[model samples]
Target chain A: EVYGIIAMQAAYRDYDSGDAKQDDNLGGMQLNNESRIGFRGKKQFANFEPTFIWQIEGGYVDPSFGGEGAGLGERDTFVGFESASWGQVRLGRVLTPMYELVDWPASNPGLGDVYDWGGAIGGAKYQDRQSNTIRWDSPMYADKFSIDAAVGAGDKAGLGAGDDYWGGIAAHYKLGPLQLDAAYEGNRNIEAEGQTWENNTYLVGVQGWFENGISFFAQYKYMEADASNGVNEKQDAMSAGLMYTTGDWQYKLGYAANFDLERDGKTLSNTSDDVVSAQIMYFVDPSAVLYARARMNDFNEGLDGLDDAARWTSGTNGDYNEYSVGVEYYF
Target chain B: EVYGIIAMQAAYRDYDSGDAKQDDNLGGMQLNNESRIGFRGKKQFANFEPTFIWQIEGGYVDPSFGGEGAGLGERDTFVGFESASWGQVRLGRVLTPMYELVDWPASNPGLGDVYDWGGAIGGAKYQDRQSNTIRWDSPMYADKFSIDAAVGAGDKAGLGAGDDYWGGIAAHYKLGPLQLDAAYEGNRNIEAEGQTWENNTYLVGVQGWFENGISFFAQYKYMEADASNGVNEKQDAMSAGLMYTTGDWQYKLGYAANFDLERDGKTLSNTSDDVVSAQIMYFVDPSAVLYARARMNDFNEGLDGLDDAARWTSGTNGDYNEYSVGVEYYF
Candidate 1:
């Protein structure tokens, strides 16, 4: 099968701030790229419909807006076998089981900046999308529960010590009208780019769906790393969201907080942050949706370092807010 | 439809050069990535089958070998309207008509390095694949002739004058048992990155297919550029190839030469190169093929600058050769 998502958004950000220490360009309108395309197919030689599956997904691309994106295999691409009673196992580039959950009910609706990538030490501690990995997905049990696990070797840190490794596990369980999720992830000999630390993280979350069109989710996460250089650092975060979906329209609101970074058991002054996001969406067709989103970010202190450049590189690095109107179509 | 080629090659290069002026690592083994996947579809709404056609092709990908290639829309991607009689017209990223013919019958069988990107200035003279372009292709005339043309705005040069513009035209006419090709291309306000010259190029080529399973192609190109800074430059090149197919196996050979570059009518000393490539292939199935290829590159004088890194960065930029065995499957 061939599939893809065509998505683009026009955003407005308040970029004029006194503390900004990066590139300037918040004065006018800008565009965001979250568009992608891919291809997948399954061999149908077997009877049980248990066959081989494979997919190749490309990354975001808006040629003129910026430049080309990271090319093929830049998404969830894999080659694997599946069995009805057994399960599915694949090899290739993919998101870890733990990350898959963290990215969803936990980081959606614009909570990513506050939780997935923003933290005490001000960086992504988890392997969101990893390469060179082996992963497994267990069949649903009684139609209510399943587990996912993965292991991978990270890009070599060039420590001349050998290679780095990471692993993660996640489970999803359905209870009544609630879906509960839990995950654990850890890595050794991680990147030498940041602090050459060994990181371990844990997360818990739950999502509730009601027959009347009310849905909500809440998540919490804790992470700690031993800075091989001689120090212990930790970060904590939480997010909550609610959405009401009527037959014609949908409304959502979400909030998240990045507590603080603790170094050697001492809280780093002015190192916390928070975000609030709201959205409204309407289905234009069975394959398309129209949406408008707004986000407000508050910072205890401006991030003037490279770590924060991934999301915000305002000229002043101060608190910023934005609103966007976008559309997406799936094929 | 979803389609792709799964291909990779194990190559050997002698990298230990004394005059090497770049990164090292030619000591042992390396891999070449040319694999890709994409999605394409043509709507079926009109009776004349004059439908809209679009495609998205991603770059090469081999997750663990190294890293990913350039992201989506990194290949021949476009959205266009095709008519049963009016021909086809499209806009997006596409190879210029001139480059299309220059690439094939001219660069196949591993001859790209010598002609496509290794001329006088040691860089690609003509835009192969370009963005922000509008193109038109004519339906084959009596199943023997056609034409393609395009115009585009290049990446802004930050000159503040205006966007750069380029255009090209190409024609193919099947003459008896041979297909003859001709093209012309020109660009104004070209790149400020290298000399900032306005370049114009012309090419002519032909291919022949015989009933005895034999085929051959030959091409010639000439280019000139005005530096816009009081100087004029020029370069010349040629390539020839032959192949034979016996149903069970195919054998091929090719050779190409890049003449010296001229600046202000003065030939640059030791600025020429040549290459020879050979290959043999066997069909493993209706959808797969196995092949082995060899290439020998000779240099009049090793390139000691940055422009040559695209192909060889051997610490001691010297003559290099390689051999490879690979497999490819299409779906």
Candidate 2:
């Protein structure tokens, strides 16, 4: 099947100029393109045998802002198979099972900037989409539990025994109106920059729904890195969100925070950040949507070993806020 | 419709290292990937009115050799309108009509090195696919002749009045036993480097088909540029090819050459280059094809100011030959 979305937004942003690069306030109206196209299909020869599955997806085409690495297979792409008795197994570029769950339900409503992959003291984020990966998914058991496990390698070509390797597992359980999620990810000398460090992350979250279009979710994340200096750094972060939908209209609000970072039992007092965001969306039709969003970010706590100019490390570039409206169509 | 091709080739390549960079002989087995996927569609609201056409394409995903700018909109992408009487008009990243015809029939079968955009003194070639372009193709004039014209700009937000602009025209005619083609392209401060140079290219070609599935084509290209200094540079190049196909098997041979480059009134010796290539292909199935190719490149004359290592300037890296076999599948 062929599918894709062409989405664009007009946003007015305000930025805090730091002492590092520029002397003027850098803020303005901007265009954001979240457009993409993809192809997918599957085939099965026998009833009980595995069904072959394949998909190739491309990245956003933001020509006006200069090409942003737009091309085939720049997104998630894979070839795999699924069977009732064998569960499912896929190989290629794919999201780690743990990162998959963390991406959604936990990082919506503009919260991803802080909760997902923000750099700084709240660092060492988990890998989202990864290449050279082989993953397996377990079928739901007892109507309550399921699991996902993945392994990825980039060094020795899938032998997966080198310094550049990633592994992760995610577990989910459901009980009545609430669901629980937990994940663990680890990298053995990630990116192999001198091959001197290892990273590990753990996350736990829960979500629930109530009558009358009401639902909420909350999560906690911990990141750890063993560095060459023997003074490994540890960071803590958290996120929470609430949503309500009535008919074609939906409302969502979310917040994420990075607590102070610690190294060798010493606190990095200035290493903290946070953001709050809200969104309003209307389903114009099954194939179309209209939406507006706003986000407020604060990085006043600053970064370790850095001055006030450190805010530039994040895309927001400072303590600022943004407002935007947009539309999207899918086919 | 969503469609794509996944192709990969295994080849042995040899390179002659020049005194310029390295000392070791650089030759090895290489994996050549030309995989791509795209989406396209067209719609017409009423008769006699223009039909809206759109297409998005992406680049190859050679992840095994590290990422190669693979993403959506990394290739030719555009939206346009076409009508029987008005021809076709398009906006966005598109190929100039002149370069379109130059790409096929004249420079195919692996002859592009000299005739197309090979960056030697043979010289400033016409732009292939370009971004920020607006093009108009005239309707076929009678059953004997047709024409194509385009204009494009990248700076000043497509107003097309800046230093970065491209313009071109192509004329074609069918003469019973043969077809004649001609085109001209010019750039105003191409790439805007120092804004002191301009490039122009002219091309002429002819092709004919014969009985027994045999065909041949030949073409000549001239390149001229006004550089920073008063001493302008001019280059000449040409290509010829022959093809024979019977049943599911096809054979093709092509050759291209670059004459000496001229600066002022003096010929830059050792500036000549040439390549000869042959290909054999078999239709493995409706959706698949198998092919083998070999090319012999020679540059014994060396480059104008380069020593033996100057050969590295070209991908061939020296006087060498390459052989490869691969299969491609279309979906």
Candidate 3:
């Protein structure tokens, strides 16, 4: 089997002066080309069947930006095998289970993680994908549930001291129109500031669809970080979304929030942010989709202690908005 | 439907000490793996029939280059539509019309542009592809004549400011065993120090075959640049080759030259570079080809006025040679 996706977007973005950077409504065409093309095949033996699969995926950047913007399989490129009698195992850069579960509700429909709290919040402990990963997905039991686990060496060169590592596990269940997911991910000695840190995240999600073509999803994520120094940080995040499809059109609305739990033994307040997105998508065919999206960001007033980079906005005004129209086609 | 190609090569290259860089007969395996995996499909529409087409192609670089080197659809990723009565229009990162016509004649059979004047010569106006582009290819007239045209907003952002842009057009004709092509391409404000320059290129080519499976090809390219601050330059390039195919084996010999036409207002003399290539190829099935190539670069004596960077050599002797063996398999 072979498959691919080609997504391109054109958008106008506006940010107020609250940002230290220039605040203007910038408009341009961008290729969110979450495009991918790959191959997979299976062979049967006397005892069992094993399938081999590989994919190359990437975002097509502006050609004007020079060579750095264009490249090969910078996305989910992995070579692996799967056996029904046993389980599926993959090695290479792969998605983190926790991120997969939370992304549907936490990310914007048209722009994905670009307008998500996962990318905005510091020490979020949510990694979309990892390199040098080894993953295992168990066969579904009772035709309703399954488990997935993965581990990665991060940027570690060898099995030695000071090496960094990360791992995660997720459990998924499906019964009729209702589905549930739970996962936990952790990072150890993640190289940072000439040292390292220990970060852990827990996630839970629920999804359901009504007979009338209405679907709903919600996810909650919590994270804790222990720095090489004596400092400790905690954060909480939640996101929810609803979708309604009719004929060839689908409408989606999502909301996500980030809040500070506690840092350095001090309870934080007003260190919060919110994001809301609305999207309308039309399907031209099974392989094509056209979409328009609008997103708004609202930031709380008390963010004095946070590092400048940790804040997604450099605008002193704190709030921003983005509007986009895009197309996606697959083969 | 889907297809893929894997091409790899190993070569020994020698550069003399006259060049500032390292001069050695470096022998190593190289991934000429202009390997690609892509998908294409067609569907009949209710109105005037139009076939939507797209390809996600990429070169499989060295696996040792790590994640940054591998990607999906990094090669020629685009979406377009074609109609029998009308023509074809494409969008995204598409090849330049002139480059497409001149490349085959100006490049090595197996290594392609890697060892060509278009890639080596500075200020060469041969563009491979443009990111934000719109292209149109006319349906063949009289079953032997067609035209390709393309325009791109090279690096324009917003509605104002002097943005970079490029445009090109090509015409092709074929009747029986004879074929001919002609094209022109231009680039404006394509980013540079102080200010960018306007560069224009003209190309003409021809190809023919004999009854005994012998073939000949030739192409010529001329470039002129008008800089913002009164600096003007021009270059002339030409290439020719002959090939003989017998059953599963083929042999080829080719030569190319680059000469300085004028700098400022003075006619430069004795400034010339020459390259010669020889190849032996074997076809192992319809989708597989194996070949060995040897190339020698012979530089003229009057390169004193040229910057060292302008030379594609590493030897102080101003001459070098390369030998390579490779295979290409497509499915």
**Which DockQ-derived CAPRI band holds candidate 3?**
incorrect
Q: Per-residue CA lDDT of candidate 3, range A1-331, in tens?
A: 6555655555555555354333422223333444444444554455645777666555443322233144445567787788777688888877877767766555756324333433322333656776788888899988899999998876553345456778899998997998898999998877654446788989888888889999988887788887766678787878888999998899999887777557787867766667788999887777687789998776655443233333433223445577877667665
List DockQ, one per candidate, in order.
Answer: 0.11, 0.11, 0.12
The residue pairs found clashing in candidate 2 are A70-B71, A70-B72, A71-B71, A71-B72, B18-B309, B19-B309
Superposition error at A226 for model 1 (Å): 1.8
Winner by DockQ between candidate 3 and candidate 2: 3
Ten-residue region with minimum lDDT total, candidate 2 chain A: A154-163
Q: What iRMS does model 2 reach?
A: 8.2
Residue range A1-331, candidate 2, lDDT tens digits: 7789889888776766564344234466778888987778765523225766667777777723355546666677776678777578876678888788778887777777677776453223567887667789888888898899988753332221233567899998997888898999987644322324567889999988878798889899888876554557788888998889899998989898877777678887767778899999999999998999999977634553222244333544566688989989999
True contacts kept of 1: 0.20
Badly placed stretches (over 4 Å) of model 1 are A19-24, A44-50, A63-73, A122-124, A155-163, A192-195, A302-316, B7-34, B38-58, B62-66, B69-328
lDDT of 1 by residue, B1-331 (tens): 7678766555555433453422133323344445687779988675646688999986777622367554556788999999878799989889998889778878878787777766755223678888888989999989999999998876562245556778999999998879999998887776443446688989999999998999999999988877655677788889999999887688999999888778678887767778899999877556666689998887655443323243232212556677877656578
- Expressed as tens digits, the lDDT of each residue in B154-271 for candidate 2 is 4443565555677899888988868898989887664322334567888889988877798888888888877554446687878889999888888999998888777677887767
Worst 10 residues of 3 chain B by lDDT: B113-122
Which residues of candidate 2, in runs, are more than 4 Å off?
Answer: A18-25, A45-49, A63-69, A121-124, A154-163, A191-195, A304-312, B7-34, B38-58, B68-329
User: What DockQ would you assign to candidate 3?
Assistant: 0.12
**lDDT (Cα, tens digit) per residue for candidate 3, span B1-331:** 6677776776666665464454542333334445556555554423324677666555465532133254544556666778887698877677889878766655655223222433222343656765666789999988999999988655443221235678899998996897898999998765444546788989888888889999988888787877676767787878888899999999999887766557787766755667788999999889899899998876554432233333432222456577888888888
